[PDB]
Amino acid sequence: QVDVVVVGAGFAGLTAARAVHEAGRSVLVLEARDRVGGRTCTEEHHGTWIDLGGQWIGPGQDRVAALAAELGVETYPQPTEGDDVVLFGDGEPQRAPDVALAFSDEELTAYLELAGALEAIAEKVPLDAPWLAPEAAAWDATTLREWVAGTGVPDRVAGLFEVAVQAVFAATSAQLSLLHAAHYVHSAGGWSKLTDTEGGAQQDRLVGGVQPLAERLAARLPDGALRLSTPVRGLAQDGDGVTVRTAGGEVRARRAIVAVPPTLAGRIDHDPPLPPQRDQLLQHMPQGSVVKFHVIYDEPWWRAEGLSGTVLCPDEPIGVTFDGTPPAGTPGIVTGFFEGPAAVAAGARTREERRDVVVDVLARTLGERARDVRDYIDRDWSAEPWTRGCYGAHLPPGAWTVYGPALRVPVGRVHWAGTETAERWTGYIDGAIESGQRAAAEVLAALG
Amino acid sequence: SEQVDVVVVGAGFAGLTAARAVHEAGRSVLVLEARDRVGGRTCTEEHHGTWIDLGGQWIGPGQDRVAALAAELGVETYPQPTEGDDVVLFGDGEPQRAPDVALAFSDEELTAYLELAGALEAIAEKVPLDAPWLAPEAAAWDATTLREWVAGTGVPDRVAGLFEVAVQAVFAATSAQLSLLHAAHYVHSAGGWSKLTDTEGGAQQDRLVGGVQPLAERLAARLPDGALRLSTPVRGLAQDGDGVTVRTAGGEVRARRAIVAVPPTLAGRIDHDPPLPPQRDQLLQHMPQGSVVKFHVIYDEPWWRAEGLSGTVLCPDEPIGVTFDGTPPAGTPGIVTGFFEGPAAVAAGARTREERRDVVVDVLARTLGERARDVRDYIDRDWSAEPWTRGCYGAHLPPGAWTVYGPALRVPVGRVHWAGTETAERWTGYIDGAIESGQRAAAEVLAALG
Ligand SMILES: *Cc1cc2c(cc1C)nc1c(=O)[nH]c(=O)nc-1n2C[C@H](O)[C@H](O)[C@H](O)COP(=O)(O)OP(=O)(O)OC[C@H]1O[C@@H](n2cnc3c(N)ncnc32)[C@H](O)[C@@H]1O
Ligand SMILES: *Cc1cc2c(cc1C)nc1c(=O)[nH]c(=O)nc-1n2C[C@H](O)[C@H](O)[C@H](O)COP(=O)(O)OP(=O)(O)OC[C@H]1O[C@@H](n2cnc3c(N)ncnc32)[C@H](O)[C@@H]1O
Ligand SMILES: [Mg+2]
Ligand SMILES: [Mg+2]
Ligand SMILES: [Mg+2]
């Protein structure tokens, strides 16, 4: 019987396991995949790292910043300079020093007032208990889309805001409750923190990619602790401990920390079954929909044209793109996303069909040299059986106030982690780390 | 390991309908059921010398499949009691007695309610029963909650309130939880708002003598000996070019094709190899089951009948929104049947049976009167706590789900085919829709085998 069994070796499970080990307790980590990192995933292609999962850290994300500094992983800045390209519907592409300058003063004022309005709501939502917001009932009953419509902002501003919503939530404004979106904005420290590159969540990358940071963290565990390729099928508990069922047999422990996405936590055979409010909460926490891609070129040829590599095309299937080129300056990479409905449509198509869509958008925005592609690498996170959607869960109307209170409450000897349980930077690697710290502290207090 | 033509996962009305059709066509079939019984979301226990339907209990006009099955397997109906005054307790004032609930409304209020129901029906009729995502205004209707749509109509507070009781009694979910497209499809599927809400002429018209689970047991008895395997949950479904391997705790079954006839949330929990395609997996994540606690309060006699009361109370601002006289034809014991729905179900499900009883008796004392405290017994079931259901009556879809994920609802994945009331075109959410789905999935499998 080990003291603690952790299910899942993403940042949340690995943080929890390391904290349990450092306190002197025995720990086993059972991970379904043949690797650690979870929703972070890095592969070597073209002599450089390709982050198919989470890749950015930014100011305010102090847990992941501290971890990278502890484990010796350096950052490099997301490129910010050069003209952005904005394309509306059947128009011509417009170069602007920033995306914002493609809109009128009146449109930018309306967008800033709308974001400010959402921030002032967000500040009222308690980070550990969004269901305790004074207006929780009203705000849980309303979609974000209905709230945006009630502000009376013009179509164009609502459209621009929708690009930002889909980029942050991997879901449309109709899928999300206002209370969910408000909590998420509060959790990040504001709308600028979510959407800015400089000063926000897209500010910095990790030299070598993010999966190797998760691997350095896993290397702080003793040999024998990590069990890869070992999906957890069942989790039983009684008065003396827990029993984890895998295909290859059973693990006995005193307490468990389940650190997987909510939809996957619900699929484990729990004995006794989970209490109904918790089971139904997991039924109301669907993962987002995103296909993440990197377009590889021999060089970042757009830079010589004075272009950033960022394109904003609200009527195309892809979201905002980014210059993904490493510090070496080759290969040239354009990074982007299919989000929400567009990701579900794209996920039903082949890689080559997705490639063709992306290259056509880039040819029309960055220029005809976009067609001379060396490689196209993507990942539909909804097709990953051990994730079933990025970036993370969202809650539809009515879920936070009725089912949400079951989010973090331990069920006997079974404690919960994962970025969806974080108070701050929920949905991000930083929040995953928070959740693993919190769950470990719960378990260590319970064993004592 | 055993080899059969078809394995059916689940012995609810959908699974059993499918298995019987496959058997009667001459194919070998096994039915693997998790529970120690058949009937699934229908469940009957004997108490106080009569049947207690803890799950689905009513059938109505227009539900032709369940009516044909009951007739075929020799299960008689009895009518839901209709006579006596209903009691309506609004958010303000004393309880009001009326021969029908609608008489508790003002004329302005009743006109507004019928105009709201008519407007919903006009949208509903435009929603194709086989493909709600092909509605002309599908994107707009899928992007709006039913509640937002109601708010836009400008009806009076008492009208929104009584409409909300009906919404929660039909969907086991609040109007904020449901997309307008989902609600409109459900109304079309049933044949209109009256079909869903009426007793005479609607879904609550008739009961089955002896309860519903015996009907499922008679349908199971049409299978050959050894076909039904109870207390055998399916954990895994692996498939290749030639068949499917079904994994249970102790063994495996090999089949040419499978029909999975379980609630959507539980279908997604089976270990699929290869993994399910992403649209389907994410659809199941967007098909949460409802929240209901169904109860029966037992009295020695239906004493309310002697006071000229029907036993029905309607309370928009109470944890129990609606009740019915559940007394059997013999006339004893007296039964008051009702529901905690939606948020009230989740709140109630976190409390004990005795705590729920005391909430029910509190509401009944204030509406039917003092004799409501003279309880012989109280029997209830939180369907959200049932590990092999995880919520009644069935799934609903939140905004944005039907248009983006919905198209994956019925499409087979290789040799794995889908049944269940949630896949029915007509009377989806009901026993009648379960039977439809089972007939459809059996015909699909038989066509695909040859
Ligand atoms: C997918 C993605 C995510 C992402 C993003 C882009 C994409 C395409 N961009 C981000 C970014 O730039 N910066 C950032 O901070 N976050 C970004 N995100 C989100 C981020 O990746 C996640 O918030 C974070 O990685 C989540 O960590 P957490 O530890 O909570 O969850 P996980 O990584 O999913 O780990 C769960 C592990 O559990 C294993 N698993 C699942 N089920 C089982 C069972 N049954 N048995 C055993 N193991 C299981 C998974 O394999 C996984 O390793
Ligand atoms: C619960 C409920 C339902 C109900 C209602 C009131 C309540 C509280 N009132 C109704 C009514 O008066 N009239 C009516 O027509 N319907 C009413 N409903 C809904 C109705 O009961 C359902 O629509 C219908 O019974 C659904 O049938 P279906 O066959 O589609 O589904 P099921 O009954 O859930 O059966 C599924 C079976 O699968 C088993 N199971 C689940 N998971 C597994 C696995 N992994 N392996 C093996 N078997 C599995 C279940 O145990 C169940 O038997
Ligand atoms: Mg810039
Ligand atoms: Mg009547
Ligand atoms: Mg019609």
CB-based burial label for A362 (10 Å; 0-12, 13-18, 19+): buried
Give how far A233 is from chain B: nearest CA, Å: 9
Query: Which residues make beta-bridge pairs with A27?
Result: A4
- Residues B80, B58: contact at Cβ < 8 Å? yes
Helix B157-171 vs helix B180-190: angle between axes, to the nearest 10 degrees?
A: 70
Specify the DSSP class assigned to residue A170: S
Task: Count CA within 13 A, CB hemisphere, residue B155.
Answer: 27
The CATH fold of domain A2-39+211-286+396-447: FAD/NAD(P)-binding domain (3.50.50)
Chain B residue with the nearest C-alpha to that of A174: B143
Fold of B3-41+213-288+398-449: FAD/NAD(P)-binding domain (3.50.50)
Write the burial class of residue A85 (CB in 10 Å: 0-12 exposed, 13-18 middle, 19+ buried): buried
Kindly determine whether residue A389 and residue B282, on different chains, have CB atoms separated by under 8 Å. Answer: yes
- Experimentally, the structure was elucidated by X-ray
C-alpha torsion sign, points B357, B363, B369, B370: positive
Tell me how close the Cα of B349 comes to any Cα of chain A, in angstroms.
7
Segments of A141-182 assigned E as strands: none
- Which residue in chain A is spatially nearest to B279 when comparing CA positions? A344
The answer to whether the Cα torsion of A44, A48, A52, A57 is positive or negative is: positive
Give B324 Cα–ligand 4 centroid separation in angstroms. Answer: 9
Q: How far is CA B383 from CA A279, B293, B339, B386, in A?
A: 12, 6, 11, 5
- Among candidates B302, B431, B444, B292, which has minimal Cα distance to B372? B302
Residue A362: closest CA among A290, A437, A307, A429 = A307
CATH of domain B106-197: 1.10.405.10
Q: How far apart are CA A429 and CA A98, in angstroms?
A: 27
What does the angle CA B111 – CA B116 – CA B118 come to, to the nearest 5 degrees?
Answer: 95
Cβ–Cβ < 8 Å for A429, B205:
no
- Residue A23: phi, psi to the nearest 5? -75, -10
Name the A residues in 143-172 with CB < 8 Å from any B CB. 143, 145-146, 171-172
Instruction: Tell me whether the omega of the peptide bond preceding residue A331 falls within 30 degrees of 0, making it cis.
Output: yes
- Ligand 5 centre to CA of B113 (Å) is 22
Phi first, then psi, for residue A288 (nearest 5°) are -70, 175
Residue-range domain boundaries for chain A:
2-39+211-286+396-447, 104-195
CA angle B430, B433, B435 (to 5 degrees): 115
Q: Are strands B309-314 and B85-88 parallel, antiparallel or unpaired?
A: parallel
A246: which 2 tokens?
Answer: 């895998």
B356-363: long-range contacts, CB 8 A cutoff, minimum separation 24: B356/B293, B356/B295, B356/B380, B357/B295, B357/B297, B359/B319, B359/B320, B360/B295, B360/B297, B360/B320, B360/B336, B361/B297, B363/B313, B363/B315, B363/B318, B363/B319, B363/B320
Contact status of A387 with chain B (Cβ, < 8 Å)? no
Task: Point out the residue among B235, B288, B398 whose CB comes nearest to the CB of A280.
Answer: B288
Where is chain B discontinuous (C–N over 2.5 Å), named by the preceding residue?
none
DSSP A339: E
Q: What is the DSSP letter of A143?
A: B
Which residue from A332, A312, A383, A373 is spatially nearest to A93, judged by alpha carbons?
A312
Give the residues across from A414 on adjacent strands. Answer: A256, A411
DSSP for B186-241 reads HHHHHTSHHHHH-STTSTTSEEETT-SHHHHHHHHTTSPTTSEE-S----EEEE-S
C-alpha–C-alpha distance, residues B141 and B402, integer Å: 10
The token pair that represents B161 in the structure block:
């309130």
Q: Which residues of B66-92 are buried (b: 16+ CB within 10 A; e: fewer)?
A: bbebbeeeebeeeebbeebbbbbbbee
Q: How far apart are the first and last CA of chain B?
A: 24
Tell me the best of B13, B38, B41 to mutate to test the pocket of ligand 2, counting ligand atoms within 8 Å of each CB and taking the most: B41
Ligand at shortest distance from the CA of B85: 4
Amino acid occupying residue A306: G
* Residue with CA nearest ligand 2 atom 31: B12
Position B335, amino acid: I
- Cβ within 8 Å of residue A292, ≥6 positions away: A52, A53, A335, A336, A337, A378, A379, A381, A390
Lookup result for tokens 């009167």: B369
Cβ atoms of A295 and A376 within 8 Å: the answer is: yes
DSSP letter at A293 equals E
Distance of CA B439 to the CA centre of its chain: 18
**Neighboring chain B residues of A136 at a CB cutoff of 8 Å:** none
Q: Residue B240 burial (CB < 10 Å; 0-12/13-18/19+)?
A: exposed
CA of B238 to the centre of ligand 2 (A): 25
CA gyration radius for chain B? 22
Chain centroid to CA A404: 19
Q: Decide: A48 and A190 in contact? Cβ < 8 Å.
A: no
Element housing A160 (H / E): helix A155-169
Tell me how far CA of residue B395 lies from CA of B59, B362, B403, B409, B419, in angstroms: 19, 30, 16, 12, 13
Taking the mean position of all CA atoms in its chain, how far away is CA B36? 21
- Contact yes or no for B233/B9 (Cβ under 8 A): no
To the nearest whole Å, the CA of B269 is away from the closest chain A CA by 5
At B319, which amino acid appears? Answer: P
Q: Ligand 1, residues A5, A18, A40: which to mutate, most atoms within 8 A of Cβ?
A: A40
Sheet holding B85-88, edge to edge: B96-98, B85-88, B309-314, B320-325, B334-341, B292-299, B377-382
C-alpha torsion angle, residues A216, A218, A224, A226 (rounded to 10): -140
Kindly report the length of chain B: 450
Which residue's entry shows tokens 């009326």?
B98
**Ligand 1 pocket test, candidate residues A235, A391, A433, A438, most atoms within 8 A of CB:** A391
Q: CA-to-CA distance for A123 and A183, rounded, in angstroms?
A: 8
Cβ neighbors of B326 (< 8 A, separation 6 or more) are B296, B311, B335, B336, B337
Distance CA A152, CA A173 (A): 15
Q: Which residues of B touch A291 (CB under 8 A)?
A: none
Residue type, A83: D
Determine the longest span between alpha carbons in chain B, in angstroms: 68
Residue B213 · residue B38 · CB < 8 Å: yes
Rounded CA gap, A282 and A384, in Å? 18
Chain center to CA of A124 = 24
Looking at residue A104, its amino acid is S
Amino acid at B427: W
Nearest to A382 among B278, B291, B385 (CB): B278
SS3 of residue A33 by DSSP: coil
Question: Under CATH, which number does the domain A104-195 receive?
Answer: 1.10.405.10
Nearest ligand (C-alpha, residue A324): 1
Which one, of B206, B215, B205, lies nearest residue B78 by Cα? Answer: B206
Written as one letter, the residue type at A22 is: E
Query: What SS3 state is found at A333?
Result: strand
B-chain residues near A283 (CB < 8 A): 265, 285, 288-289, 390-391
Helix, strand, coil tally for chain B in percent (to 5) = 40, 20, 40
Chain B CB contacts of A171 under 8 Å are 400
User: Which run of H or E residues covers position A50?
Assistant: strand A48-51
